[PDB]
Amino acid sequence: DSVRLKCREMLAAALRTGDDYIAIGADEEELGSQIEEAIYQEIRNTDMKYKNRVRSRISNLKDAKNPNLRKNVNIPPDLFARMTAEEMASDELKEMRKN
Amino acid sequence: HTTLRKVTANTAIYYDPNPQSTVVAEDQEWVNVYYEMPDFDVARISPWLLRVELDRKHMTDRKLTMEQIAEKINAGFGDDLNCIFNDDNAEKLVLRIRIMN
Amino acid sequence: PGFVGIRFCQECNNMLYPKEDKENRILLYACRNCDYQQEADNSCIYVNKITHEVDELTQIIADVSQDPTLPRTEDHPCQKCGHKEAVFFQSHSARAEDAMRLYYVCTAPHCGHRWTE
Numbered sequence: 001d002s003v004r005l006k007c008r009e010m011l012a013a014a015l016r017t018g019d020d021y022i023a024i025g026a027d028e029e030e031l032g033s034q035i036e037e038a039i040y041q042e043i044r045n046t047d048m049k050y051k052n053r054v055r056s057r058i059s060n061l062k063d064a065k066n067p068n069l070r071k072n073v074n075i076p077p078d079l080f081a082r083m084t085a086e087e088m089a090s091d092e093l094k095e096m097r098k099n
Numbered sequence: 100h101t102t103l104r105k106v107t108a109n110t111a112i113y114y115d116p117n118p119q120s121t122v123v124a125e126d127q128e129w130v131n132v133y134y135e136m137p138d139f140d141v142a143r144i145s146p147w148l149l150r151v152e153l154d155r156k157h158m159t160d161r162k163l164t165m166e167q168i169a170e171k172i173n174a175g176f177g178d179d180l181n182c183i184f185n186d187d188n189a190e191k192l193v194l195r196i197r198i199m200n
Numbered sequence: 201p202g203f204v205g206i207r208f209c210q211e212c213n214n215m216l217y218p219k220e221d222k223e224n225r226i227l228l229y230a231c232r233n234c235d236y237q238q239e240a241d242n243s244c245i246y247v248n249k250i251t252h253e254v255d256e257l258t259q260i261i262a263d264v265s266q267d268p269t270l271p272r273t274e275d276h277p278c279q280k281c282g283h284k285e286a287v288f289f290q291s292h293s294a295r296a297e298d299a300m301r302l303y304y305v306c307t308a309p310h311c312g313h314r315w316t317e
């Protein structure tokens with residue numbers, strides 16, 4: 001269904017923020033389409049009842065205080081899609097504040 | 100025993116008829132994430148908004164998350180009560196509760 | 201968030217309450233008696249500070265500067281007028297009282313400058 005298509009297109013649109021994908025020189029549409037699959041293969045319901053995963057990956061890629069996460073995608077998508085704290089442990093300043 | 104009162108910083112009720120131009124500037128950029136790909140129809144979100152902003156100390160002190168709070172509130176009242184919340188990685192822990200039409 | 205306050209009807213001087221413009225989807229203020237009505241200024245219906253974040257300065261008053269039962273310090277010249285003598289005391293408000301935070305006021309007339317450090 002198009003539900004997966006639009007939300008992984010939005011994942012690709014999140015990966016490109018700040019031209020970091022171009023500074024690194026990587027193709028982000030493949031990455032977004034793979035990230036949505038990595039999420040779905042764990043949250044395996046058709047309507048993605050827990051699409052908090054996708055919404056949060058989108059936003060956290062767009063989080064300007066943790067651009068290093070946007071840079072990393074070298075931790076592959078298969079790991080990113082599952083991360084607790086929505087992967088913002090990599091921010092390492094919010095992580096220290098929470099600690 | 101930890102109720103919504105212990106983790107909340109402040110609460111406010113607003114007439115916020117359009118989240119894509121929400122009355123709170125602090126929330127507009129993160130509300131856009133929830134409204135640029137809405138998982139709900141703009142016609143069922145009531146324009147009346149109850150904003151609850153949480154203390155990161157009282158949330159992190161006990162590892163609480165925006166997801167838990169929204170899930171809990173949706174269960175305590177129900178279909179008549181929509182809940183939106185800021186991302187756990189964002190700077191401000193904010194909840195945006197709206198009556199569902 | 202701001203702070204909404206009571207407004208009185210120009211017709212009956214009774215308190216005015218917020219009402220939504222069901223058509224234009226905006227906020228209105230209306231008298232519960234007469235149809236006196238006006239468009240609302242805050243977009244906020246209500247606020248409730250759970251933390252009780254408060255501008256203690258609003259409840260502090262300069263008149264306390266002459267209280268003879270108030271401790272005075274020559275050690276803290278007035279930030280406004282520089283006068284050496286200043287009275288100091290704690291913020292007797294439940295959350296401010298729990299914080300035990302001190303407030304200083306100048307012991308100089310018409311100055312009455314009150315500050316916290």
Ligand SMILES: [Zn+2]
Binds near residue numbers: 232
């Ligand atoms: Zn009236």
Ligand SMILES: [Zn+2]
Binds near residue numbers: 278282283313
């Ligand atoms: Zn002075």
